[PDB]
Design a protein around this ligand. Structure first.
Ligand SMILES: [Zn+2]
Length: 209
């Protein structure tokens, strides 16, 4: 039944209105998050809770294994809305350890549609086959690939014309790579932050319009 969810909602809404009766009314007027979160759909990685944000703070995209593709208008439209319309200052690319999407990309079972979605991670596993091979346990290979994935996705976001054109017009915008431990609740910085055009390889730089 959906009863408990409806009941949780009515209790939550009422609790907030008791502490601040204008809470939702004020929020509903203007959307002004400083952050966009790009993360995995995994139920164990809820964005707001992990970084203690409130409704209104965090624009969110979640997909399988937090993949960013330059032909995917789903993720790209979230980025473009965030960057062009909301003018978020930060894009938080957050992958996590023990990601099943990353895991699936390391094995050879077919999962259907998802197989094509995860292609780019599978590409990552192949380019780093040497590195990954020198790690003993599958858990280690998976977790390293989770990190490699995040670092790659940070690159992918920063290479978009969406993000470059924000920089061209002097908009302040940083793309961060973080990784969440589902084993310990800790959200960790991979320290791969990109905040300007000068940090991009020449081959990915696009001229202003
Ligand atoms: Zn995941």
């Amino acid at each position: 039944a959906l009863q408990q969810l409806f009941e949780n909602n009515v209790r939550w809404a009422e609790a907030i209105k008791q502490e601040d009766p204008d809470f939702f009314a004020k929020l509903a007027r203007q959307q002004t998050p400083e952050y966009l979160w790009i993360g995995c759909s995994d139920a164990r990685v809820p964005a707001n809770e992990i970084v203690g944000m409130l409704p209104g703070d965090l624009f969110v995209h979640r997909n399988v294994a937090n993949v960013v593709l330059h032909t995917d208008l789903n993720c790209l439209s979230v980025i473009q809305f965030a960057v062009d319309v909301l003018k978020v200052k930060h894009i938080l690319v957050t992958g996590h350890y023990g990601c099943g999407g990353v895991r699936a990309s390391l094995h050879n079972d077919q999962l259907g549609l998802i197989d094509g979605w995860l292609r780019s991670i599978r590409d990552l596993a192949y380019e780093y086959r040497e590195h990954l091979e020198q790690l003993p346990t599958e858990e280690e290979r998976v977790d390293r690939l989770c990190e490699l994935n995040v670092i790659q996705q940070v690159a992918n976001v920063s290479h978009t014309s969406i993000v470059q054109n924000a920089w061209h017009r002097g908009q302040s915008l940083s793309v961060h790579g973080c990784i969440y431990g589902i084993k310990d609740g800790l959200w960790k910085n991979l320290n791969v932050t990109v905040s300007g055009l000068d940090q991009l390889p020449p081959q990915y730089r696009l001229s202003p319009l």
